[PDB]
Amino acid sequence: QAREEQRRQALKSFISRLDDLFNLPHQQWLPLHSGAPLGALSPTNGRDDALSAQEAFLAACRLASTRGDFQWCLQGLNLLVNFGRLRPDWELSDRLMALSLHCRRPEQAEQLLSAFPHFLACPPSPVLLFTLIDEALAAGRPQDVRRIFATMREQWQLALRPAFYVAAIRAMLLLPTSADQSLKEAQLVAEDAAALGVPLPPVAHQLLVERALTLFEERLRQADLPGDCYTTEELLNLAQESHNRLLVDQARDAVRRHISVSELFLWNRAPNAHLLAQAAWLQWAAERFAERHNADWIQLLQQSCSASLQELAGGIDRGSSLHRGLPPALLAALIRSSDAS
Amino acid sequence: LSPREFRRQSLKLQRQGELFGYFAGLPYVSWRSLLRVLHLLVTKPFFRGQDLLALPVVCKRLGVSDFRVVDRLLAGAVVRPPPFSLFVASLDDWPVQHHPHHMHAVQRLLAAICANLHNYTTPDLLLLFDGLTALQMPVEALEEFEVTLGLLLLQIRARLREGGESFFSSRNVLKAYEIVSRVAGVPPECWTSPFFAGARVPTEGQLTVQKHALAKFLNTSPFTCSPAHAVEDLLCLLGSRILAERQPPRPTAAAMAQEILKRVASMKLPVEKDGKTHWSVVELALKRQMERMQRDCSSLESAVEVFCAADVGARLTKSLKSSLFWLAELQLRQATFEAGPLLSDASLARLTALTPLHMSALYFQLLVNELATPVGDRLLLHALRIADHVRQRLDGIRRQLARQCRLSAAQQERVLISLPQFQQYNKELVLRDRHLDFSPFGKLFNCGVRTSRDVLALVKVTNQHVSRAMASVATLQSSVQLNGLRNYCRELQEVTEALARSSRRCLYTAIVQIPLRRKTWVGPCQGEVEWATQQALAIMEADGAR
RNA sequence: UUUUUUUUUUUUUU
RNA sequence: AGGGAUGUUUAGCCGGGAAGUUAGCGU
Known about the structure:
part of a larger assembly, 2 chains, A: 14 helices, 0% strand, B: 546 residues, ribosome, Complex, translation, rRNA, Pentatricopeptide repeat domain-containing protein
């Protein structure tokens, strides 16, 4: 009964008792502030010697760890507001957000983000907002992370972050929809990340999008489907476009992160070979006809044949992307073309 | 040194170049003290000693935050008759208030320089240009930064071709080249924009200042730089390699950077008022045996080079003879960070790719990523490490905090009885750091913990690692679909998901069971500084006006 | 002296 | 390593208003 009796009794009394206090005149109410400053016996005396209204309410909120007590805490909050004894601050917004979470009430948490700026000064902590995104993913509901992202983005108060853009992308590709439908929605968020201040996503962003891009329809259209497309132009065009976006982004990222027959691999210093994997893809054609349609990679793939890059005797990359290759795009691709041939 | 005599000789201390040294000293810094310091902070902000470097840091911790005060300080160093690299790096974590345009600290330098771009000499040009070298905001306030950087080049080009005696020396050419070279290589897209293309004699509010410079430059030149202006910059340097005093200039600089509006105070804590004053195959075995000799010697920064050198030589030698005719070192990792770590930096990254509690989390994310590309790396190290981490989490800080910071039973039956008893024993309900023993926290596989802040600090580090790892596992689950795969997915999903969600829970507890408000005895406060700030400002325009 | 402010002002020492 | 770090209670006089109070002869 240590977790049931001693827990409910302590919280019930604290709020009940507090209510009665307010009934007395203002002369018997708790001070707003902790204490007087130095301006108003050693300097350590005073300052922090009295219990504030705010401090008492937040102290009793540490007892909740169930859904039943979550409602109870709200009761106390209202009292302060109605009596004009609440001072919004950074701390206030932080604990409130977290209190819902600790009570196993994710539903209520989301509501806060759309109702904080109406009655509060400071926004919640960035950490908290990010953590709630993973909550939905663990339960298996990737469709509930689209509305939360938009509200944050639209809001001006909250500072824009590059990291925040990663979560969104990752969650959309896991939706339980068709291959073409899932990718189409993901591209919309990507696009949005290039207009408003031309944000630069991390280096490990373009890789993910590109992985599935040239695998879900491109690869599929030349393996079993053309047995003896409707957006073939867009798929190919977007493939290369993605790559381009990465180049521009990565170059500008290094300047602010840490204030840094024909070939061009003779006097090019020692760059990272990790990126050459995606750029080494051979362009077959726009259409099925690979011989009569299009007339415009070995030398590119000669840098790493045995799956051994110039890592041990080359340069060092900071916060690089996945080192691994394309199992579902390289291993099963070349073999088929050869073995079957 | 009591505050009484500190204010008397304040003037003299400034001259000596040692002002801030005694400020971060004895207690008792009241409004009286604060005001005095602030008085001189806006009258003649000129520093020569080490105070320049230590100015930004004091301000951060002080509380002073104004668009005017901040701006005036920076402009002092801008004007010209320790390294500069250090100063600019300090311009971080310093928000600016009372400004609807520029809110950060990095936008100050981009404005001052630009404004006075027309009052510079060639020797000093290189000085400012040296900011790209290593020893800003993540994404925001970045368009302004590169736009102003290109303006420097324009001036340089124009100024250099004026017809060289100082920078044309044998040693100056090399120095200049170092900086120039860093720019060239990846021309940002921002140069190829309509803003620079406007050579023919609504704009954003952030580029208000920048736009002004262009107009002036173009008019005094008799031109634009739309494309990646190169070659010419390098060709000129190739020929030399292949073959009242300072008082007047300040106020104009602030006036140009000044916005149309007077003061846009979006947020105001104190009450609204106004203050005033009255004054052939033999070599294969010769080098392959040198791979196990370093294991005993290395059981660090120099030892890693031995393994890399031997690994590449073992593979290359056999490669030639391959197409011509026709390791369990990870076990040692369980006794360096799982049984008491000591001085383990981020270097473990390189010692994982085939070569406190936070340290174990690092390895968890790396091992799972490599395996995503059955008994020797799943049930021996991957599953064994999770058992140790979970054991130290449920009964670690989670439970500890629930026994020390939570309300005790004593208080329940002492205070929480009747209403009248609440008005006398309310003092005992308070919780402080002093009242909390940190000893239990020091045995969590480590005194390294002094304050409450340290406890919280060691929470976000571990949750970050696991949070990232969960995404990798989820991606693989939805990728392998398009019966041996069932065993590698059913067991991996149920085990990985237990640690991702459970770890997050800890954060919630750790954030709520902490002291409320409270601060270290330093000096003034944000409330006091705000009133002082305005008084310090209005005071200046009383004395000098008569 | 304590809640309320669409009736105010003041704060420096060579 | 940025999912970091930093931030936390400002002081006195006078005039008017509401609730409680409505005990004082010590000047």
